[PDB]
Amino acid sequence: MQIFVKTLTGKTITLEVEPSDTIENVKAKIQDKEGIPPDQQRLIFAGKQLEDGRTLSDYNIQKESTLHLVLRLRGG
């Protein structure tokens, strides 16, 4: 199963994952291809924030589905 993670700049993150991976692990993988830590990540999919407590099956994130890399930087 292969997917694309698009950054707000353009550059895209193609990756390898099992349909049962907890979103939280898609971040652990993105944390080694970009160095961007997990707590500062937000993967939006078709206008929906894909939680960490779910998987790639819970949102039907199939082969080739593009999520997004919107950096949660602004502080609070």
Binding site: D39, R74, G75, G76
Partner: protein, 146 residues
Amino acid sequence: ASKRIHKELNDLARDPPAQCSAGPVGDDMFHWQATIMGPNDSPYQGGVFFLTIHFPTDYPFKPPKVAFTTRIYHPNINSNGSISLDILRSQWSPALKISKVLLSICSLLCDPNPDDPLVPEIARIYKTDREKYNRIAREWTQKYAM
């Protein structure tokens, strides 16, 4: 804004948000002052904290400016009493009500947010040296809250 504020005001004396009480002081209806009692069994126990709810003429399309008056040692509230709380800025909705913004603040009090800090020094001391933090916060409450 007028009827909005007024009505939102009567609603306070309808279901007084537990642990706090905000209300307009003076006759100005755009300048209120609220109190928040340090949540229990939290280092801010015992003390009381004053705040300033200033409604801009753009309320409710623009969030109200809420700030701490009483000094407090917390990771998301600085020495000006500025509060880094998302509903006050980014996640504000014209539907949100003060009674909700107050409790939301009481929450931030007992269960701080060390990962989206406003005062780094404290955040760290709260993450690494937690017991230190409680010591201090407890001391500050004894100085400015009582």
